């Protein structure tokens, strides 16, 4: 009956382009969905070494990795076994705009993640094209039901080389392939850390938990 276990495996294939630089990445990883914790190692197979900040991709490489308390409906764990997809728009403060889509399927113990990524209008000596991002700041995303599906808005900042912050607005729409119990408006706190990039291979780690307002 439980299609998602305490320990999951992760596979990822990403194809995309940024400013007309095409690339392709594969990665494998391990996760504990009920703890909201996961990690990855990615390997760039085309376009490497990446000429842009890995950070614009990192949040693209699954809301099932979020500790959901009882009394918040878990949209993501309930979408299985059929799975769910999501689309996301990234509007960066310097005009850079990224559209991304993703399919997530379930095969026994392994999440299979299908990511397409298009970024455009990133300035030549911006922090993205010159790869001067350090990390995303920890975040809290707001999840609301809209057109019968879950939506997820978050204002996000990248810390830059030498300090200072580079703002981005996320709009993610989550589409379950199936009729699930709909959640209320709630939040999901996030924290991603990017270890060990070298252009070609990188490590990701993320902790996320869903919570409510303190009414």
Residue numbers in the entry: 5 to 65, 69 to 222
In the authors' words:
Wild-type SAASoti and its monomeric variant mSAASoti can undergo phototransformations, including reversible photoswitching of the green form to a nonfluorescent state and irreversible green-to-red photoconversion. Photoswitchable, photoconvertible and multi-transformable proteins are fine tools for multimodal measurements using super-resolution microscopy. Reversible photoswitching often proceeds via the cis–trans isomerization of the chromophore, associated with the change in its protonation state and plane distortions of the π-conjugated system. Photoconversion is an irreversible photochemical process of peptide chain breaking, leading to the formation of a new π-conjugated system and a redshift of the spectral parameters.
As it was shown in the previous study, C21N substitution abolished a dimeric fraction of the mSAASoti at higher concentrations and resulted in the true monomeric protein. The crystal structure of the C21N mSAASoti variant in its green on-state was obtained at 3.0 Å resolution. The analysis of crystal contacts demonstrated that SAASoti is a monomer supporting biochemical data. The mSAASoti has a typical β-barrel fold with the chromophore 66HYG68 resided on the central α-helix. In spite of the moderate resolution, the electron density clearly revealed a maturated chromophore in its cis-conformation as well as conformation of nearby residues. The chromophore is fixed with a number of hydrogen bonds with neighboring amino acid residues. The oxygen of the chromophore carbonyl group is hydrogen bonded to side chain of H120, while oxygen of imidazolidone moiety is fixed with side chain of two arginine residues—R70 and R95. Histidine group of the chromophore forms hydrogen bond to side chain of Q42. Finally, the OH-group of the tyrosine moiety is hydrogen bounded to side chain of S146. Noteworthy, the orientation of the chromophore’s tyrosine ring is stabilized through stacking interaction with side chain of H197.
